Design a protein around this ligand. Structure first.
Ligand SMILES: *[C@@H]1O[C@H](CO[C@H]2O[C@@H](C)[C@@H](O)[C@@H](O)[C@@H]2O)[C@@H](O[C@@H]2O[C@H](CO)[C@@H](O[C@@H]3O[C@H](CO[C@H]4O[C@H](CO)[C@@H](O)[C@H](O)[C@@H]4O[C@@H]4O[C@H](CO)[C@@H](O[C@@H]5O[C@H](CO)[C@H](O)[C@H](O)[C@H]5O)[C@H](O)[C@H]4NC(C)=O)[C@@H](O)[C@H](O[C@H]4O[C@H](CO)[C@@H](O)[C@H](O)[C@@H]4O)[C@@H]3O)[C@H](O)[C@H]2NC(C)=O)[C@H](O)[C@H]1NC(C)=O
Ligand SMILES: *[C@@H]1O[C@H](CO[C@H]2O[C@@H](C)[C@@H](O)[C@@H](O)[C@@H]2O)[C@@H](O[C@@H]2O[C@H](CO)[C@@H](O[C@@H]3O[C@H](CO[C@H]4O[C@H](CO)[C@@H](O)[C@H](O)[C@@H]4O[C@@H]4O[C@H](CO)[C@@H](O[C@@H]5O[C@H](CO)[C@H](O)[C@H](O)[C@H]5O)[C@H](O)[C@H]4NC(C)=O)[C@@H](O)[C@H](O[C@H]4O[C@H](CO)[C@@H](O)[C@H](O)[C@@H]4O)[C@@H]3O)[C@H](O)[C@H]2NC(C)=O)[C@H](O)[C@H]1NC(C)=O
Ligand SMILES: [Zn+2]
Ligand SMILES: [Zn+2]
Ligand SMILES: [Zn+2]
Ligand SMILES: [Zn+2]
Ligand SMILES: [Zn+2]
Lengths: 207, 207
């Protein structure tokens, strides 16, 4: 019997309209003695609002049981600790796992948009670059928009640890050169805990 | 046998030149079986640089033992967790205590200086007021200075929880009216984790 404790989806923690949840999964439950009890604690205080699902048999003759605890937007961002305790008559002691948001002093990202390189302006499609740097912790979301619609022809690098202990990344949006020359406004949209309302956007256009 | 785990002095965490330390104290050690072992962990990783003092007998026929772990300035501010584990042959299991810096999103104080009330200007001594508001967490240090020397005739209120979840306080420095009228410059000096370099000062003078 092993326990895995998963954090909420990062975007779910940065948008007050969403519902972040922590997920506790127990595997290798022997379906001879498959009795499983979950206890949940927030900063050591037991809470009772988790939603545990019925066990599901696995093809390897073991059971798997999942319990989901909803977490408050402010609680997660304020560093509360979530402990999942799993009890079972086959273990010499209960299994405990604790999780929290990534720790450390927060640092606000600086968001910079970079136009296509001059040499790239000869190609049929061009690269629009969004540099996000100086942020901590590394949890972040980046998307692109133009004229009130998503621009989804982009790829974003993972966060990279910079020499000052903050993170940076780059996002690359590829557009037809004609749309760049025509002067459309493209926006790099960034979500990170340390931005005001966890959100900022920076625009990019021919100039 | 009971264990108490104490945080560093708040000023010691805010000045890089100082040495913050966490202090683990075990009392009611029965000096029949007074064998005591400390284990220390930083975010669950065992560390070995604590300095444990020799036991001291108490007048109530018990022992008291103290162990001191130095903590790094950045580790404390970045929210690392310090666990002191105390083992003794008389307890059914070891005693664990964990401590960290006060949790929660940090908020930078706003520091405002307020001159004496007009009605107070008739008295022999006047009150110089420093309002510090909007800060989180509540750990803070406030002192007063003038012309490169400490002004120590002051009292500061405890932090008070404000309606937006931040803290405020006031500090009152009492000076001779003649020094206020003469135009001396008085400075409210504030240390808090969320200030740049954890330090700011605001001046007050007749104007
Ligand atoms: C018996 O079978 C058991 C059932 O598994 C079956 O496996 C399939 C491959 C089948 O083909 C078949 O073979 C089996 O029927 C099997 O259980 C497995 O046991 C593994 C350990 O032995 C365990 O491995 C761990 O996996 C962790 C990652 O798990 C995630 O990703 C994998 C895919 O990579 C996926 O299978 C899981 O379901 C997990 O997926 C994540 O789940 C969370 C929780 O729901 C999601 O988070 C939520 O997402 C929602 C939306 O989806 C919301 O956002 C919500 O708010 C969130 O909370 C998350 O999105 C989702 N991600 C993805 C990408 O799907 C590893 O982290 C873990 O690793 C540590 O691992 C070891 C230490 O143990 C070391 O390498 C490292 O130290 C590392 O730190 C570990 O690898 C499997 O997860 C588990 N499978 C399941 C389904 O639970 C069992 O082993 C079998 N027994 C025997 C004896 O064979
Ligand atoms: C047998 O005797 C034992 C020895 O005590 C003697 O008591 C004296 C009064 C004598 O007159 C005589 O009676 C005895 O010989 C006795 O041990 C005591 O046991 C108490 C519990 O039973 C325990 O109470 C706890 O006290 C905590 C506060 O302790 C601090 O403050 C008190 C004074 O208020 C002081 O006595 C302590 O020494 C502690 O002082 C703090 O110590 C820390 C660590 O050094 C300092 O932090 C460091 O400071 C340095 C610079 O100084 C640096 O800054 C460094 O970086 C820092 O880490 C700190 O500065 C210092 N502060 C001060 C102001 O001095 C309470 O927090 C605790 O409370 C919780 O308490 C209960 C739960 O248990 C509840 O009320 C609450 O839930 C609350 O949350 C608790 O009250 C005593 O501390 C302890 N005494 C000592 C000296 O260790 C034992 O009980 C006797 N046994 C019997 C059976 O009678
Ligand atoms: Zn319950
Ligand atoms: Zn913890
Ligand atoms: Zn928020
Ligand atoms: Zn050691
Ligand atoms: Zn510092």
């Amino acid at each position: 019997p092993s326990v895995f404790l998963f954090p909420p989806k990062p975007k779910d923690t940065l948008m007050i309209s969403r519902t972040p949840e922590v997920t506790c999964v127990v595997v290798d439950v022997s379906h001879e003695d498959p009795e499983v009890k979950f206890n949940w604690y927030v900063d050591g205080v037991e809470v009772h609002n988790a939603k545990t699902k019925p066990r599901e048999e696995q093809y390897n003759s073991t059971y798997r049981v999942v319990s989901v605890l909803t977490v408050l937007h402010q609680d997660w961002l304020n560093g509360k600790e979530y402990k999942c305790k799993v009890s079972n008559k086959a273990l010499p002691a209960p299994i405990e796992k604790t999780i929290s948001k990534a720790k450390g002093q927060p640092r606000e990202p600086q968001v910079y948009t970079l136009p296509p390189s001059r040499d790239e302006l000869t190609k049929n499609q061009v690269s629009l670059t969004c540099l996000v740097k100086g942020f901590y912790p590394s949890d972040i979301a980046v998307e692109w928009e133009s004229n009130g619609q998503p621009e989804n022809n982009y790829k974003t690098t993972p966060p990279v640890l910079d020499s000052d202990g903050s993170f940076f990344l780059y996002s690359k949006l590829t557009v037809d050169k004609s749309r760049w020359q025509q002067g459309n406004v493209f926006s790099c949209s960034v979500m990170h805990e340390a931005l005001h309302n966890h959100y900022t956007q920076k625009s990019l256009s021919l100039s």
